[PDB]
Structure 1
């Protein structure tokens, strides 16, 4: 505790006594002649210490300090995810024991936990003889951590892995599990440091925290400074000169990350560290958002309007990708405004993302996919692809990423719907060029080939299917007409019923003769068929016969409704096709005006048919929940319904106070 070393690389005296050896050291380093005075052996020792301090970013004393720049640089293939380089290094024949240590860490990162355990045991056996206290201690700790990871992995696999994966995996032979369980009997990590040579215990005390069940607790408890509200109103900025709580927290996070990844400690993989990074980065981003919003409230939006109080770099992007879950990314997205943050170093991020794409195109295109590696790697892959919305990409990296996501991604993790939302996210900034439009076309074609079989059927949690991919491609290229889908349609026959339906979903993309032969199979014979065609099949316009169907069923139910008035009874109306006729009579889809005679049955049908005389007291605001985007826009357009539903949405947000109602209230109307 003689000095207070600081994240920026500034030393400060603290409870020291007598001669200031650090101030003398820095004065000596600055002046060369003073160094010339020093003894030869002490000169070489000074050169060693100079290189050490320079490497660890210790520059000078606080008073002598100034515009100290800080640039994190973690030099570790594990951190950068250079999987091929790690494997090549593993194949190479080790020279020293440090090479074995790094190789064991690389093996663990690559999922080969059995080999990592074996190599750590070897390293322990050799290093106890070689009197390498540091390597012996760190290998012990990393073997215990890999053993814990193996145990939790077998627990998860036996409990649920067989279920989620669809088949049981036995990553570890029961003989190996028995061997490790027998070896680690009664092995308490706490005594490890205390049983060491007192020489090592004295010199390497800074490593004692590694054995302890948990660390970062002083770093975690120091995250509260990012939850301060007084700071935005008035911040002392006294957490550190020329710095703040934000800078200190970020540099402390980088210190912890570099120390663990560069010293090749397995604790980087545990839940404690992941949650630590989640908390730190989320709190930093939220603090930046809070400061930006308060500045916009105090100063005009012209000032601090979209300030990048936080500024993502390569290391920030990889942190978020590796340590966050998709739910955490969604939490940050909804709470903060991630689009207001600017992303730098985008070329290195593009390299990292194309490396992710390559790794998923190798890991799964190949018949074999290490399962223990897969479970940890797929979360990072899908988080990185999810969080690539804000980063821009070149056509080549974007092409590889789209190819890998659409075709070389597991279906277990990303269904068709989640694949679609990932892709659309990628399209926000890197608006689709034709090169990846071709990839999307190929994906749709493969989906059709799968749909040829009568058992296949898409599964989607978000309710989006290949029709959405078709809509996206058509939206970005208005007149795109795939040739392969067109020839699939032409080769089509009535026997290929499910393929017929699928191609019907993708109707816009098909050529004239293709969609002609398609719609040849299907036709409308009644109002049920008409609504089925409009809903699916895209009945472009209500032909005169279609309008006759509308009127036929409308008057049939008009007679039925007269008989209902005679009953005084109306049990239920399963499908109000009259509501559809209304939105279709409000959309000018029905040129015929006869149905205007039919009115008074459904308050919604009156709402759409003759809104002017329609009593808007009847109107149910819940209908606005169901109305599509264009329908709400039109309702805003029509003068008679505009103000009335302005009032109804105002009342709903005023009384019920629901938030989707507010979204409809303003994002569309006012």
Structure 2
């Protein structure tokens, strides 16, 4: 009869009779009319007022007025208060509803087998009291938690052995047998139909949850709204009145609230993660577009002010929970989140440090809840990665930095991975001394891990402890690490890997420690050369060092010739030849033997012989790796500027990457 819009207003839809719903809102402002009812009838009106206002129902659509409203989530589970859940489980049992909250907290905490048993006890005790609602929801939630444990062991059975280094069996084989027996011939589709009818006519609004594909009406509406919003963004239309971006923003909160409230286990489901991920990523896209919007002569003045959308605490949790690190990168490369204001930052930092202490407890005391760990590491990573966009206090940063460099398992966060996230935290606020102390302890801990003497620093990004020293030296020009300094006296050509460690950790070593190192241990192979330049130890191409480069370059031709006969073409991404060429491109190294080498690497041939290099094989992605000064002063010379200009002109219209656009604007003018 009446359509309740997500904004809060109502509108007649099929009410062909008296406007009772409008009459209810007609009495909303008239004080005396309410008193004209019977005492019980007036009492019911008061109860409906409490229900409607809590649920966000607002007055009639004619009396619209201001309609901006911020929703709130009173559920502790959504806030990730894992410490509160632990004591909430052991509070005995007051009522079935209280047990229902315990079971949902149990599932979120990771104790799924206990949660499943709790859900089993709920349905048995729900015969009377006409409380089928909690029985209905627990029945679905028991099915969902039954589904979750089946894939959990399946992941441990498959894809789990290699990721964790061994097999984990958080659930006994008997429990896996028990759960499937109780779930035999259970089709959830007819659960609403196959359950007493007095529920069927009263709780009709819950019929949309019975089907397994219950996350379809909202996603379809989101998908249609996403298309509607994207049409406005491309066309530049000004959304007068209620705008779809506000609509989708409200819809996800209602969906988020309705599921985290009432203790629905589907909040952890990937489709819900997918639902929120696409919901907010659209919002970020339009927020970036609104900031980067042409100020047209018409329709410039409208309801939306300057920076109409603000990043709030609730959005941060959703971003930190329903996103993965790669999708966040796609959001970053598409929209600049640093420009949009982050509201209630102080209400976010305690959440970030709160997630840090849970990480600290998991990986320091005894073992870790692996079933919970899989369900938590994604949220844990997403929160810390996104922390770059929020200002944090010294105390807040210290706990997070301690968590980042001391507790994350290497299986999900390697040595190289931490540095990328470390730089994000360091860029937001200037590095204080307290953070450096934690960083220093991290490096010395890795040195002591060499007890087995077969551990090698292996990183995904290719960045090693080499970069940690560079960050320290960049922020602290003079810094000496005593702990690494003292270690050198005890080591006398015993651990070669630990010996190699000191070379790339030189700027943090003392004068005596550095003297003892180079006394009879120094550069012998080409690897230590560029390491020294980054360290700063090697500053000039000494005659002996230039011999080392060409000697290694000679080896490559041996394989290069033989591989051509059989058709092979080895292209190992060492990029050392590119480093040799760029040095020669400024004739900083003037050996002619390496100039003879040609046809080896496309980038290498570019630097050595610029004019006669075959530009048809040039790749624009190499330009992303180049310094500033060489590009800046090369303008106007035109000996080799014009050749790359054709590539430069192509990229601005072919590619939407801002980095290519920046290069052609700052230089080549």
The two structures have a TM-score, normalised by structure 2, of: 0.85
The runs of 5 or more residues in structure 1 that have no matched partner are none
**Displacement, 1:541?**
3.0
Greater Cα shift, 567-576 or 510-519: 567-576
The answer on whether the counterparts of 1:214 and 1:272 sit within 8 Å (CA) in structure 2 is: no
The 8 Å contact of residues 232 and 291 in structure 1, kept in 2 or not, is answered as: no
Per-residue deviation at 1:417? 1.0
Distance 2:323 2:575 in 1: 46
CA change 1:24–1:427 in 2 (3 A) is same
Structure 1 range deviating more: 34-43 or 166-175: 34-43
Residue 263 of structure 1, CA deviation: 0.6
Q: Determine helix, strand or coil for the equivalent of 1:521.
A: coil
Q: Secondary structure at the residue paired with 2:587?
A: coil
Cα 1:161/1:545, change in 2 over 3 Å = closer
For this pair of structures, how many residues does the alignment match? 669
Which segment is superposed worse, 369-378 or 594-603? 594-603
Change (3 A) 1:59 1:305: closer
CA separation of 1:105 and 1:476: change in aligned 2, threshold 3 A: same
Distance in structure 2 (CA, Å) of the matches to 1:564 and 1:201: 74
Q: Are the equivalent residues in 2 in contact too, given 1:451–1:502 (CA < 8 A)?
A: no
The superposition leaves residues 134-166 of structure 1 with CA deviations (integer Å, 9 ceiling, x where unpaired) of 111111111111111111212222112122111
Change (3 A) 1:433 1:94: same
Partner of 1:45: 44
Contact persistence 2:560–2:570 (CA under 8 A): no
Q: Residue 131 of structure 1: CA displacement? A: 2.8
Contact 1:10 1:65 survives alignment (8 Å):
yes
**312-321 or 338-347, which moves further after superposition?**
338-347
CA contact (8 A) 1:415 1:460 kept: yes
Compute the displacement of 1:197 (Å): 2.2
Matched, 1:137 2:136: yes
- In the TM superposition, what is the alpha-carbon distance from 1:281 to its structure 2 partner? 1.4
Residues 238, 22 of structure 1: alpha-carbon distance in 2 compared, 3 angstrom cutoff: farther
Alpha-carbon spacing, 1:599–1:188, altered in 2? closer, same or farther (3 Å): closer
Deviations 1:243-263 (A, max 9, x none): 210111110100010000011
What is the distance in 1 between the residues matched to 2:33 and 2:121?
A: 47
Assess if the C-alpha contact under 8 Å between 1:296 and 1:304 holds in 2: no
Shift of 1:415: 0.4
Question: Between Structure 1 and Structure 2, which shows a larger proportion of helix residues?
Answer: 1
Q: After superposition, what is the alpha-carbon deviation per residue over 1:332-381, rounded to whole angstroms, capped at 9, x for unaligned? A: 12222223322111111111111111111011112221111110100110
Return closer, same or farther for 1:317/1:665 CA change in 2, 3 Å cut-off: same
How far the C-alpha of 1:439 sits from its partner, in A, is 1.2
The residue number in structure 2 matching 1:82 is 81
Distance apart, 1:24 and its partner CA: 2.4
CA contact (8 A) 2:290 2:307 kept: no
CA offset digits 1:256-275 (Å, max 9, x no partner):
10000011011111122111
The structure whose Rg is larger is 1
Unpaired stretches in structure 2, ≥5 consecutive residues: none
| TM-score (norm. length: structure 1) | 0.85
Per-residue CA distance 1:32-75 (angstroms, 9 max, x = gap): 22222221111221221111111111121111231133111001
TM-superposed CA distance for 1:591, in Å, is 11
Shift, 1:495, TM fit = 2.0
- Cα deviation, 1:301-360, whole Å, max 9, x if unaligned, reads 999999645422111111111111112112212222223322111111111111111111
Q: CA deviation at 1:447?
A: 1.8
CA distance in 1, matches of 2:169, 2:414: 25
Inter-CA distance 476–157: structure 2 relative to 1 (3 Å threshold) = same
Question: Which deviations, in whole Å up to 9, do the C-alpha atoms of 1:530-588 show, x marking residues without a partner?
Answer: 67865888412345876899999999999999999999999999999998777556668
Contact 2:504 2:532 in 1 (8 A): no
Q: Residues 15 and 568 of structure 1: is their aligned pair in 2 closer, same or farther, counting only changes over 3 Å?
A: closer
Cα distance, 1:214–1:226 mapped onto 2, change above 3 Å: same
SS of alignment partner, residue 77 of structure 1? coil
Q: What SS does the corresponding residue of 2:428 show, helix, strand or coil?
A: coil
**Alpha-carbon spacing, 1:472–1:296, altered in 2? closer, same or farther (3 Å):** farther
CA distance in 1, matches of 2:488, 2:300: 54
Deviation at 1:470, TM superposition (A): 1.2
Distance in 1, Cα, partners of 2:191 & 2:101 = 21
* Structure 2: distance between partners of 1:453 and 1:605: 39
Cα contact 2:229–2:245 (8 A) shared by 1: no
Contact 2:240 2:302 in 1 (8 A): no
- Return the alpha-carbon distance in structure 2 between the equivalents of residues 561 and 193 of structure 1: 70
Q: Which moved more, 1:447-456 or 1:300-309?
A: 300-309
Contact conserved, 1:490 with 1:513, CA < 8 A, in 2?
Answer: no
Conserved 8 A contact 1:239-1:245: no
Q: Say if 2:611 and 2:640, in contact at 8 Å, map to a contact too.
A: yes
5 Å matches for 1:209-288?
209-228=208-227, 242-288=241-287
Moved more, 336-345 or 205-214: 336-345
TM-superposition CA deviations, 1:162-197 (whole Å, max 9, x none): 221111111111111111111111011122211222
SS at match of 2:640: helix
Could you tell me how far apart the structure 1 residues matched to 2:565 and 2:440 are? Answer: 57
Check conservation: 1:624, 1:632, Cα contact below 8 A: no
Q: Is the contact between residue 289 and residue 309 of structure 1 (CA under 8 Å) also seen in structure 2?
A: no
Structure 1 residues 623-632 or 503-512, which shifts more?
Answer: 623-632
